[PDB]
Design a protein around this nucleic acid. Sequence first.
RNA 1: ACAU
DNA 2: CGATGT
Length: 135
Amino acid sequence: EEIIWESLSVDVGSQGNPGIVEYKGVDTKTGEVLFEREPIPIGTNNMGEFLAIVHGLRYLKERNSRKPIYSDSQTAIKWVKDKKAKSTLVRNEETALIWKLVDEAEEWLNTHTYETPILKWQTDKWGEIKADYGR
RNA sequence: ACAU
DNA sequence: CGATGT
Ligand SMILES: [K+]
Ligand SMILES: [K+]
Ligand SMILES: [Mg+2]
Ligand SMILES: [Mg+2]
C-alpha cells in the first residue's frame, strides 16, 4: 500500500482462453472508462493484458500525462519491461490479428520512450482492479 | 508456488 | 473443471 489513486488501471476480458479478447483502461479514482479495445476474435489473456498496458502507455504519452499504470498481470508487466511478449499462442490464420497487434505493440515499445511507472495492482489487499470486467 |  | 504465463 497505498493505492496511487492518480493513475490509469487496465484489464483484459475474454470469452474463452484462448478466445475472444478485449481490454479497457479506466481512471483508478473515478472508474471513468478512458479507452476500450474492439474485441479481437482469438487471443490469450496475457496477450490482451500486454496490449492493454502498451495502449495505456501510448494513451498517456499522447496526452502528456505522467500518471502510472496499474495492471494485475505479473506476466504482462514483465513482457512490457522486456519489450517482448513471450506468448505460446500458435501463429495461424485464426490468430493472425492478435499476433499483428502484439508485434506492432512490441515495435512501438522499441521505437518510443516513456517514464510511466507500471505498477502491480495488489488484488489480495485491495480487491479487484478497477478496470475489471466482472466476468 | 505465484500472477491471471 | 479448463487455459495462459513466470
Ligand atoms: K473478470
Ligand atoms: K498453472
Ligand atoms: Mg487482469
Ligand atoms: Mg479482470
